[PDB]
Amino acid sequence: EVQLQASGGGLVQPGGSLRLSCTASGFTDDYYAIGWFRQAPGKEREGVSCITNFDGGTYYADSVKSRFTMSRDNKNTVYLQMNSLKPEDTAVYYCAADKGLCSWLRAGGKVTFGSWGQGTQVTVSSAAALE
């Protein structure tokens, strides 16, 4: 059965790091794409990153291109390493997969002809130093 299991959210200080994971099960077509989009408080959805299963090509939204890195573990997991985190990165992050489109990277961050899992909260705040 097709599943997208997520994990790795939390509260971190600005300049910090967090890693999100998404384990994709049951995908047998070579042409899927997997990645993330996010929903920041009071903002419209925004695409974050995408990896195409064919060729392993990686795509990033301009807002995260030099700070975030996506990687894969062939068990069926993709990782989003977030570094130099900024308060504006605070959002609910959703793992998504589509039919090789990376649709959520178009303006508006809307998945089309795809699938998405449950959100994971990532908060970047000075409040994190108070644990």
Nearest Cα neighbor of 113 from 16, 29, 23, 20 is: 29
Say how far apart CA 81 and CA 130 lie, in whole Å. 23
Inter-CA distances, 44 with 20, 94, 100, 104, 120, Å:
21, 13, 23, 12, 16
User: Under DSSP, is residue 110 helix (H, G, I), strand (E, B) or coil?
Assistant: coil
For the chain, how big is the Rg over CA atoms in Å?
Answer: 14
Residues 77 and 35 sit within 8 Å (Cβ to Cβ): no
The structure tokens listed for 108 are: 């508006």
Q: Cα–Cα distances in Å, from 97 out to 30, 47, 87, 100, 110?
A: 12, 12, 26, 8, 12
Resolution (A): 1.8
Q: Method of determination?
A: X-ray
User: Quick one: DSSP state of residue 108?
Assistant: T
Distance CA 22, CA 7 (A): 7
Question: What is the Cα–Cα distance from 35 to 54, expressed in whole angstroms?
Answer: 14
Residue in this structure with the two tokens 């068990």, named with its chain if needed: 75
Q: Which residues contact 45 (CB under 8 A, 6 or more apart)?
A: 37, 38, 39, 104, 108, 109, 110
Reported in sequence order, the residue ranges of 1-131 that DSSP labels E, i.e. its strands, are 3-7, 10-12, 18-25, 33-39, 46-52, 58-60, 68-73, 77-82, 91-98, 114-124
Rounded Cα gap, residues 64 and 115, in angstroms: 22
Class at the top of the CATH hierarchy for domain 1-131:
mainly beta
